[PDB]
Amino acid sequence: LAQQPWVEKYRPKNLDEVTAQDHAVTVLKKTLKSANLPHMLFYGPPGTGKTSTILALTKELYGPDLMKSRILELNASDERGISIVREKVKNFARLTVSKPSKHDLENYPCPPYKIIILDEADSMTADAQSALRRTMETYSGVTRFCLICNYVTRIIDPLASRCSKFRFKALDASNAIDRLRFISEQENVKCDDGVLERILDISAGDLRRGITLLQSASKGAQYLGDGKNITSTQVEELAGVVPHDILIEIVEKVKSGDFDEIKKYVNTFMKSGWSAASVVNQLHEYYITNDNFDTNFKNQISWLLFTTDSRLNNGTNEHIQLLNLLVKISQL
Amino acid sequence: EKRSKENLPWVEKYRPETLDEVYGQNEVITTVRKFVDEGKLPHLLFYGPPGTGKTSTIVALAREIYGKNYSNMVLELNASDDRGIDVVRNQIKDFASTRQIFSKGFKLIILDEADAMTNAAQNALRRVIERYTKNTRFCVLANYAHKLTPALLSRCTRFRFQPLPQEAIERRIANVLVHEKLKLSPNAEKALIELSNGDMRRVLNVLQSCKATLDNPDEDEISDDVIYECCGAPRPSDLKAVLKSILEDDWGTAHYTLNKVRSAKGLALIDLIEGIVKILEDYELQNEETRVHLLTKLADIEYSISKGGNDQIQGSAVIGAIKASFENET
Amino acid sequence: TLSLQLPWVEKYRPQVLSDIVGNKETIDRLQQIAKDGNMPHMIISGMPGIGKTTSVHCLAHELLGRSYADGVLELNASDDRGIDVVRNQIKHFAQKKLHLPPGKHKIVILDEADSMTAGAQQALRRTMELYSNSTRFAFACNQSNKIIEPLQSRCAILRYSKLSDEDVLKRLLQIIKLEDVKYTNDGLEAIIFTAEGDMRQAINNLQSTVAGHGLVNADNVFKIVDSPHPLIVKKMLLASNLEDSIQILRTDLWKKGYSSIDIVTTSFRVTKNLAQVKESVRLEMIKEIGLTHMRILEGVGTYLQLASMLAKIHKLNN
Amino acid sequence: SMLEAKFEEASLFKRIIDGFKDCVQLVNFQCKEDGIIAQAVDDSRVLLVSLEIGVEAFQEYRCDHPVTLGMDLTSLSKILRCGNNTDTLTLIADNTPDSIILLFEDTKKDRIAEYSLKLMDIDADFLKIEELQYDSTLSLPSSEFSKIVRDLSQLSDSINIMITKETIKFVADGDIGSGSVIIKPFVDMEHPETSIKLEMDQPVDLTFGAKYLLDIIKGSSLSDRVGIRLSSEAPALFQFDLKSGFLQFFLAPKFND
Amino acid sequence: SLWVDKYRPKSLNALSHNEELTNFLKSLSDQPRDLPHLLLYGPNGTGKKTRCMALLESIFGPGVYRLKIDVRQFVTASNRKLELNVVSSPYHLEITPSDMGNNDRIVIQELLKEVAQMEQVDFQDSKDGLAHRYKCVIINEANSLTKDAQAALRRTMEKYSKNIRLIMVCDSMSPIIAPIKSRCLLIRCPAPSDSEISTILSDVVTNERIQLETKDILKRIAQASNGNLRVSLLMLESMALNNELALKSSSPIIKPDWIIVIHKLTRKIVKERSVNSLIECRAVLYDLLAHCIPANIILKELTFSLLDVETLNTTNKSSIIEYSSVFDERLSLGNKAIFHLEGFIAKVMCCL
DNA sequence: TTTCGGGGGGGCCGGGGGG
DNA sequence: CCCCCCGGCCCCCCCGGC
Ligand SMILES: Nc1ncnc2c1ncn2[C@@H]1O[C@H](COP(=O)(O)OP(=O)(O)OP(O)(O)=S)[C@@H](O)[C@H]1O
Ligand SMILES: Nc1ncnc2c1ncn2[C@@H]1O[C@H](COP(=O)(O)OP(=O)(O)OP(O)(O)=S)[C@@H](O)[C@H]1O
Numbered sequence A: 001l002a003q004q005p006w007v008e009k010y011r012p013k014n015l016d017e018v019t020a021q022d023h024a025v026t027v028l029k030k031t032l033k034s035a036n037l038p039h040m041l042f043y044g045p046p047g048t049g050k051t052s053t054i055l056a057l058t059k060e061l062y063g064p065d066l067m068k069s070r071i072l073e074l075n076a077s078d079e080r081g082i083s084i085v086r087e088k089v090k091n092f093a094r095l096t097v098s099k100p101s102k103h104d105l106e107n108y109p110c111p112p113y114k115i116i117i118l119d120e121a122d123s124m125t126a127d128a129q130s131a132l133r134r135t136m137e138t139y140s141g142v143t144r145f146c147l148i149c150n151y152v153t154r155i156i157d158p159l160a161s162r163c164s165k166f167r168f169k170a171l172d173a174s175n176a177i178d179r180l181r182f183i184s185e186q187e188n189v190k191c192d193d194g195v196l197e198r199i200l201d202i203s204a205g206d207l208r209r210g211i212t213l214l215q216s217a218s219k220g221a222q223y224l225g226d227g228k229n230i231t232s233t234q235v236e237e238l239a240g241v242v243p244h245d246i247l248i249e250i251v252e253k254v255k256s257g258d259f260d261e262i263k264k265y266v267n268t269f270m271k272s273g274w275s276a277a278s279v280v281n282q283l284h285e286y287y288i289t290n291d292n293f294d295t296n297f298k299n300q301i302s303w304l305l306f307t308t309d310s311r312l313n314n315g316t317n318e319h320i321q322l323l324n325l326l327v328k329i330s331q332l
Numbered sequence B: 001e002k003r004s005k006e007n008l009p010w011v012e013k014y015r016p017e018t019l020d021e022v023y024g025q026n027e028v029i030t031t032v033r034k035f036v037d038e039g040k041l042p043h044l045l046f047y048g049p050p051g052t053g054k055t056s057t058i059v060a061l062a063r064e065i066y067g068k069n070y071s072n073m074v075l076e077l078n079a080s081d082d083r084g085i086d087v088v089r090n091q092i093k094d095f096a097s098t099r100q101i102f103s104k105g106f107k108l109i110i111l112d113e114a115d116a117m118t119n120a121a122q123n124a125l126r127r128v129i130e131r132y133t134k135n136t137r138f139c140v141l142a143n144y145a146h147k148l149t150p151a152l153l154s155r156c157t158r159f160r161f162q163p164l165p166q167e168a169i170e171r172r173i174a175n176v177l178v179h180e181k182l183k184l185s186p187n188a189e190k191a192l193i194e195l196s197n198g199d200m201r202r203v204l205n206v207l208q209s210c211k212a213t214l215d216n217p218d219e220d221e222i223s224d225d226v227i228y229e230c231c232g233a234p235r236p237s238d239l240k241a242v243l244k245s246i247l248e249d250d251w252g253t254a255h256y257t258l259n260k261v262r263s264a265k266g267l268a269l270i271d272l273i274e275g276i277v278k279i280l281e282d283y284e285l286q287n288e289e290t291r292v293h294l295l296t297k298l299a300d301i302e303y304s305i306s307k308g309g310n311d312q313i314q315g316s317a318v319i320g321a322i323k324a325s326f327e328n329e330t
Numbered sequence C: 001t002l003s004l005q006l007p008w009v010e011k012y013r014p015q016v017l018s019d020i021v022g023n024k025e026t027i028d029r030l031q032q033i034a035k036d037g038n039m040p041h042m043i044i045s046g047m048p049g050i051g052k053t054t055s056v057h058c059l060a061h062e063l064l065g066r067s068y069a070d071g072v073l074e075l076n077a078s079d080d081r082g083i084d085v086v087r088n089q090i091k092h093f094a095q096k097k098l099h100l101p102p103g104k105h106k107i108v109i110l111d112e113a114d115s116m117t118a119g120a121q122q123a124l125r126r127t128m129e130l131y132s133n134s135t136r137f138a139f140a141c142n143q144s145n146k147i148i149e150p151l152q153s154r155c156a157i158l159r160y161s162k163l164s165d166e167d168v169l170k171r172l173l174q175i176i177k178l179e180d181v182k183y184t185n186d187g188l189e190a191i192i193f194t195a196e197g198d199m200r201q202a203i204n205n206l207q208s209t210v211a212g213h214g215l216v217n218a219d220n221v222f223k224i225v226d227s228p229h230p231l232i233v234k235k236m237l238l239a240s241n242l243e244d245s246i247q248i249l250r251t252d253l254w255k256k257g258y259s260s261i262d263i264v265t266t267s268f269r270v271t272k273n274l275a276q277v278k279e280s281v282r283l284e285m286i287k288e289i290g291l292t293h294m295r296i297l298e299g300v301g302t303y304l305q306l307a308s309m310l311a312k313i314h315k316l317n318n
Numbered sequence D: 001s002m003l004e005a006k007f008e009e010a011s012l013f014k015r016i017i018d019g020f021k022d023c024v025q026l027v028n029f030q031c032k033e034d035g036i037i038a039q040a041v042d043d044s045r046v047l048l049v050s051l052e053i054g055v056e057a058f059q060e061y062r063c064d065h066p067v068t069l070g071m072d073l074t075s076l077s078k079i080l081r082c083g084n085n086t087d088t089l090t091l092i093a094d095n096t097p098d099s100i101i102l103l104f105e106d107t108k109k110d111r112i113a114e115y116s117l118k119l120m121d122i123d124a125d126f127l128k129i130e131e132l133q134y135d136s137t138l139s140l141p142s143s144e145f146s147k148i149v150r151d152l153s154q155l156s157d158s159i160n161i162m163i164t165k166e167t168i169k170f171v172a173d174g175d176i177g178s179g180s181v182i183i184k185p186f187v188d189m190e191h192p193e194t195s196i197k198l199e200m201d202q203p204v205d206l207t208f209g210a211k212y213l214l215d216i217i218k219g220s221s222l223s224d225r226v227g228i229r230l231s232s233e234a235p236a237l238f239q240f241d242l243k244s245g246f247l248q249f250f251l252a253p254k255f256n257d
Numbered sequence E: 001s002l003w004v005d006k007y008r009p010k011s012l013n014a015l016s017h018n019e020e021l022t023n024f025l026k027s028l029s030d031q032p033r034d035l036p037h038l039l040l041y042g043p044n045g046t047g048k049k050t051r052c053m054a055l056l057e058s059i060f061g062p063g064v065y066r067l068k069i070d071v072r073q074f075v076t077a078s079n080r081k082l083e084l085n086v087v088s089s090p091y092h093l094e095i096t097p098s099d100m101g102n103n104d105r106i107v108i109q110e111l112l113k114e115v116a117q118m119e120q121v122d123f124q125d126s127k128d129g130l131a132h133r134y135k136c137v138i139i140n141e142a143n144s145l146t147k148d149a150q151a152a153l154r155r156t157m158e159k160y161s162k163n164i165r166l167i168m169v170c171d172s173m174s175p176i177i178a179p180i181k182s183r184c185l186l187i188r189c190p191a192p193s194d195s196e197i198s199t200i201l202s203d204v205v206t207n208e209r210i211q212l213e214t215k216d217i218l219k220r221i222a223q224a225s226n227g228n229l230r231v232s233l234l235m236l237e238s239m240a241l242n243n244e245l246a247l248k249s250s251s252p253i254i255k256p257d258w259i260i261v262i263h264k265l266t267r268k269i270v271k272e273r274s275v276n277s278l279i280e281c282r283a284v285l286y287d288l289l290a291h292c293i294p295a296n297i298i299l300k301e302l303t304f305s306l307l308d309v310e311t312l313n314t315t316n317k318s319s320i321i322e323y324s325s326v327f328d329e330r331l332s333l334g335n336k337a338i339f340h341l342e343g344f345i346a347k348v349m350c351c352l
Numbered sequence F: 001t002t003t004c005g006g007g008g009g010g011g012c013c014g015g016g017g018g019g
Numbered sequence G: 001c002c003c004c005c006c007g008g009c010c011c012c013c014c015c016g017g018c
């Protein structure tokens, strides 16, 4: 509707609306007739469709009515301590499946089991997972488990063994362009050629970010009211991408090799609010794909960029990390 | 359960019911069978990695000893139940100190996943085990021995469950393919065994997914391509091409090749790193420094990936690490 | 099939103080106390499976004869031993009036006393002091430091040492003779080597063999009993070349099913107890092992991490 | 509906449930054309509770096909506490049911309370555990048994029952002392309800835990007398007779060692 | 009232710098019924909270500025009693969960959810008495939230988007986890230019009738603020008060006490490099930390003051910046800040 | 100092039983 | 109708390696 953001408005309603996860969606659709759904472990990068996929699977399995009494959803917003796992989850798994109605039986497959969805399971402690092990194993006849996570390494090995793994691939301009184009057409968004491809390249595997950026660009165009196609320049501006002139200036200052000049330029640059991650990514793209650098230089710069990115991922100070990275590059 | 066994996941549908259906643990199975057949069952400690057949083995042993009604003649406790010091003091002691209800016999207590129990409960269990040995025996199952107190380990006979050998996995796969009307090629079986890492759960889950992937399972044979598609794992040819490009091409060509290989099938960098590490393990390097640098840098990259981060930077880091490490061969 | 047979550990549990091997001086002292009575408050300490509970029970039985039922109060970790229990039940038992020969006293046996809380130990003090004329206390523990100093001051310290290879061989041969077990010298050597001074484990493995293979030779013993993984980890850490370390890790530890957390913890312990290596080098190796352990606890329990740990250790030792 | 069983007052069912709610947690009811047979086992697997309620106890009972309902006793008690004791109580179930409906109806007013309790998947058999020819069988007023059990439990956590020719002995040995109660068979025509009867084939001697007997004696509120059947190598059977049914406790004796 | 607060604009049309951002905010507020969750990131003191309030005033009425403070109870698993101060208006609620430290998660799992799971009674401007609009929750210092609280925010942001919209403000997106950034529309808030700061200061001076010899004085204040407009206004007020409301070309630039202490520490470190100097530096660090000076701020200012020393060479500065990066990472992952600060000072002393 | 979980020990409160 | 016994929450405090 008009009162919902595009990300929620265009959330897939059925398994056929998932864009580029066929390697798992095909098996999930097969289970509709097979009726032997195994324990599932969905994992992948942010905004790939895991939650949408499980919700659509439940929708198609039980229908709008029977779903509520057949699904138990727990996420990071709910307490999931060892006691909760040992009592509430166990009690729900021990219950008999709710009786389907005639409507449900004649119109939906109605498999003879219920589903417990532990979304964001990577946030659960190891003790809770250990408690879940035998709960899932014992009552498989009437219950099936779905664990959704971003970092699969956070799931204890026994649980990963018990579950069938599904890796959700990153969504890029090659496999997700169709969905973005469909959304743009349904929203009557006018864009220049390559704008959607640029959006998907900037999002870097996250379709939610791409849809949000498209909505922001559409809002800007509507406010302007000029009846002109959205260009890639404003798309880059909305995404926080540093202008190429600024990147070239930074590269030139680094090539100069003077500590004071680099420090002054970085101090001026940090006042614009550019995110350190975007700057590091752009510098990596510029340096790795440049032919005017030797193998040794690229070998060193790759490790320098990796170290800076790892440090930034820990929530450090952007100014200090960026200055250190630029100084180290200038000394190569 | 509900409906029938055909609705169960394959990992559960094929759970062994007798000791003759447990594969790959011949020594342990033979020893335990001899123990039960001669009335000399000691306290048991089954230590092993995931999906090796410990729970199945103990359940089958209990079924053999007590028959179908074994569920009502044994006391099974796992991490899903409360096993505090009070539980040990009251419930376990009462069970071990009392006679059977349904039929005469000795008492069996199965402390599955005993590595998740507190130290106080383990200490309380010592004299319970020692005092009621005449009529009760204890079996404890573990994946991590460091979590079990030395006193408890001293009281139990240890049986180690090795990772499943390849021939046992082939036999189980043959049985499954006989039950499920499926056709599997030798290359597909080789890839499945390679990726299983000695876990039967992985074998069964991947086989079920492969069957679901086939358009016409009755007359369609699972090939290595099907396995790699369902599992989303790199093909060996892709790993070899990536490694050859990294070790024999310029930086731009290596970057292009890595990007193309990853984009063609949407592979994850972590799987590529694992495959390259496996390939390089067999390489005969002339200098220890090369191996040291490879191992350290690749471990750092894997740890960084475990926490997320930029994927392109991580791929470039892998390329640079391999190049720098191999530059030491000279 | 439904009739269990008594394990040899319980079947051949020494019933007299003369059947206990090891700690000759302390055992003879206990025999002298039994002969002459006047047992003092005592604390027996040691490591698992050396004969502490057996010694205490044998001493109590020999001292009290047929009055064992009324004169002995046994409490262990499996029983509730809180402050209220100490104040009520133990105090009542100490205050009880019982007729015994001139040289005998009532005995309170607090097995696994290290698990008792500080408050109960505090409450036991004046009970021990005031009623010593009729009651005596025997504690058995694995870690003496858990017992508070006031209680240790009131007791006689008996720190049992590990059984030598000779004592283990003697007891094993006695059991073999009483059971008519076919064996070879190499089989006994393997059993004692794997026992690591633990009598209980030695007897358990000896029964497992014969119960499963009849003849106790080194081979048959090693088809069920695995060589202690601490020794394999020590060999891995002391290997001269990194290739040898990695080969040991792959073949003897990873391919056998040992978990990464177990391997890293064992590496920590072994490095802590490597007397032949300089302390600073050991500290650096411990730092590297701690890094690897922290990574493993986060969830990255991969063979690559252990290989990197070995590579860093070899880098340190060069 | 598949199954419909009416109690004139909810009090009877509440008292029946209260008789064994403190010893077991999960119960399984099998309802047929002959009535309701329920079984439950304690966590320690030392006590078994078997309840039988005949069709005569219901104002109106109808059960077309046998139905099995596995439930948790604490939830059932919580639900029952929500209904008044003076209202008719109807248990309703359907084919392959997923829940049991409790209907509290007050004929005085138009107040109807519907409570749905979700069933749990429990696949188990009753095994019809009952030994053919017990070594000894006695019966005596429930008040005397309860008094003896309460008196002896204060001295020890274990109670020994010995049956010999015209002699029933309850013994307890503890830290502060010991107690022994000896009773002989006797019959009084003036008040036969106070008589105790015994029939003995072989002498018996069995030890039991005090806590389990303390739980068992709670069933004295359902019957004025209690029957104890004792046999070596078999669990002791304590039976309280209802108007048209029974409540049985099978207690495993302690190992003699 | 202070000039910094007395002259804060209260509407989008009243903004005076970063006109492009103002146009973007107007475009976002044009059709607010489908406004996504917003995350404004930018340097401190630039006007992020002012712009958020202006956006809310553009969406709702001026009533967004009629604020009131309430106190909310919370109970932990151990029965500990915690208080949270909530600033609320008839249209939005403002919260700073980081005030409860590691307990912030509870606020996300109890308070926010409670707002998003229920409707509200609106007896003003609504005929039926029930609100027909989504409620806005501002989360201040969102970068201070623990990972558990951020994880808890995830499904709450999606399930109840029809009833709740979140507007978060931060000085750096590095501590924000990837899913939360993916769930938000990111808005960069650049610092005002020197000329814009000078214009604002000149307007304030004209309004306050402050005698100014030359406008360059304002310019001198603008550079000293390093793009921080709040600092600029407060420094202007302090300078005016320190010169009888009459500023001259020689009016010295006033620096805060903690900055002076950090500069003195830098001078001490440069001059003296010894263990006793390290002990004195530890005492100074303890004094700074005991008076609510964040450790990260201390490390940043000390690093930049050291890098501003003219007597140091390039190698020393490179070593200093490398150590600063390493120990900033250490601080991000540690509890005792004094330990990491002392380690950094010792490493710098060794390098010099 | 302290971000859970377990364990122990004390103080109330209240159901039930007895007089 | 009132008093006493003794089960169950409820709360507070203290470890947590070999
Ligand atoms: N495969 C997809 N197909 C279509 N839309 C998608 C897809 N993936 C993500 N989206 C879009 O992005 C929105 C969010 O998708 P999600 O299912 O929430 O992704 P997610 O992987 O569950 O996010 P995380 O792991 O909790 S950060 C959807 O409502 C869709 O609008
Ligand atoms: N030796 C085996 N032979 C046949 N199937 C096996 C074997 N081991 C594991 N499986 C299969 O994998 C499933 C799980 O086996 P489990 O007995 O649960 O392994 P486990 O070692 O007890 O798991 P952990 O240690 O609690 S993670 C079984 O139902 C079997 O289908």
Ligand SMILES: Nc1ncnc2c1ncn2[C@@H]1O[C@H](COP(=O)(O)OP(=O)(O)OP(O)(O)=S)[C@@H](O)[C@H]1O
Residues within 6 Å of the ligand: B126, B151, B154, C008, C009, C010, C012, C013, C014, C019, C020, C021, C022, C046, C047, C048, C049, C050, C051, C052, C053, C054, C055, C141, C142, C171, C199, C200
């Ligand atoms: N010195 C010994 N001589 C003969 N048998 C021994 C000896 N020590 C232990 N055993 C045997 O091992 C069994 C157990 O001995 P224990 O007395 O329980 O050892 P423990 O040191 O008290 O164990 P802990 O400290 O509670 S783990 C005995 O029944 C004996 O059969």
Ligand SMILES: Nc1nc2c(ncn2[C@@H]2O[C@H](COP(=O)(O)OP(=O)(O)O)[C@@H](O)[C@H]2O)c(=O)[nH]1
Residues within 6 Å of the ligand: E004, E005, E007, E008, E009, E014, E015, E016, E017, E043, E044, E045, E046, E047, E048, E049, E050, E051, E200, E229, E230, E233
């Ligand atoms: N004249 C004018 N003053 C502004 C503007 N934006 C911010 N300010 C002033 O700068 C002060 C600090 O702004 P604030 O939003 O609190 O900083 P932040 O939240 O850390 O980004 C405010 O008190 C305002 O007085 C603006 O657009 N025009």
Ligand SMILES: [Mg+2]
Residues within 6 Å of the ligand: A050, A051, A052
């Ligand atoms: Mg999701």
Ligand SMILES: [Mg+2]
Residues within 6 Å of the ligand: B054, B055, B056, B141
């Ligand atoms: Mg198992």
Ligand SMILES: [Mg+2]
Residues within 6 Å of the ligand: C052, C053, C054, C111, C140
């Ligand atoms: Mg002992």
